[PDB]
Amino acid sequence: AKATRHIFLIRASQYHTLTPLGREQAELTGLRLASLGLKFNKIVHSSMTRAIETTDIISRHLPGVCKVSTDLLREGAPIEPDPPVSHWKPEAVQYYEDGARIEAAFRNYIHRADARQEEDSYEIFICHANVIRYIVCRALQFPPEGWLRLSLNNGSITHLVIRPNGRVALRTLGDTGFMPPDKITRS
Amino acid sequence: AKATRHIFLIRASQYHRTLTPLGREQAELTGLRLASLGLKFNKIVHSSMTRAIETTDIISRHLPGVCKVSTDLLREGAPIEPDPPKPEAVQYYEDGARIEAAFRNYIHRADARQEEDSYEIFICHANVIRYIVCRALQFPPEGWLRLSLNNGSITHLVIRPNGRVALRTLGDTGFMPPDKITRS
Amino acid sequence: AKATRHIFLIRASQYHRTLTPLGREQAELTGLRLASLGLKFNKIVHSSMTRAIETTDIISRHLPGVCKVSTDLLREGAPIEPDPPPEAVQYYEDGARIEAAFRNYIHRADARQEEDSYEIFICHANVIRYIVCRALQFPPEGWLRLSLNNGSITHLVIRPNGRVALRTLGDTGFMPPDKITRS
């Protein structure tokens, strides 16, 4: 493990499928990612409709970057948040299955480079609010139950860096500085 | 939940990572058997691994009009250290989480929406199916390697609406000619 | 131990008493399958129950020259109170008897045995399911979490190091679906 992994977690754009504003947001996110001057390895995306639409819009600005669909990154309830929110109370079955799946996503996608990886990687993961926030809490080895203490705008870019010795840095969370303020949403 | 779920777990046929000629013939035998059961299957969920997709296509030829679905959850992996005992711990760490997610999302009693008995086909891999079986029977999962499944085998799980699980067949390949039965 | 033991546990076919006509057909199909596997079987051990003797005679016509053996140990009974949920005495008596059956017939090869053996055990549903749970060292109270068709083949492998693999359970793929029964 000598390479560094750069993980760009993108939240799906605004949806009802994408709204008109959401499609514009995905356009802006794609423009930004393409303007970073990075050669991206893959676009892994949740298989949810809005995730597929955000990926379709973004991919036009990054043609020739391999795209990958997965059920692991689909939205769900990772674990019961602390402090409780009494406007959102999924059942135990939902935590039971979705937590297992989102934790599998974290373990499969968030790790130091394989020993065979020769060069630094730049990877885009287009998924969803709860998934991204849980991924962030776990990657930093913070109590995962605090995933709801974070907030992510639609189309935002969250930049995670994993060093070859296993150290993890959160370089940015919920970055939407590239969108006009009047086009930024969380819902 | 008033319906019963019949889950047919089929192991991918022989492969090299495409199917071998024998593997494709095995997949054909499995499809013929499934079509001759006199059951109306609701869905075919299959792993996204090459050999699983190919076996699924072959079997799908005999089950016209049956919904097909791909999943990364069902891909092969190392679920837990088998007891008695060799992959690296990173593989257990990743694959165990994913295979357990597969088990939790697919193996359960019928949902409230389900009114009538379902017959569902799951095309995956040896370790996945064996781990599923140990978990479904609430047997120690660390023993998944005490089971063995031939290529193209049928494993029949029944989940009754009260959550009870019965294993009615495991690794059935009696419908294949003995000269065409393989484990690898 | 040097040789590996291949154990074929076969459930007696459908019966009334003696086999039903369909039961006779099932036993015939099972015998055909065993004869078509291309194996030289060492022994046929069978329960002394009527239906087990009948299935054994039918199967034996297809494997003539295979030693036949009777046992009272393999007779049907109730081995343990299943979990999840017969008077206590039946568990008490039959459990000892079926556990004895398991211990006497399910084990690694004797050190003298030089070549791999293939043995057919024709008995009953509860006995076979308990045998399988014990051989795999799974909780025996879960024997009722398994289910076996009439005339089905259950294949156990015991390696000379004592490790056990269950290769097939309740195999009836060799029967036409319309002739498969569980009672």
Binding site: V93 | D111, Q138 | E141
Partner: peptide, 11 residues
């Protein structure tokens, strides 16, 4: 050894 009747939740 002892069956958990709520293995899948849904009980």
């Amino acid at each position: 050894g002892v069956w958990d009747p709520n293995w899948d939740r849904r009980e």
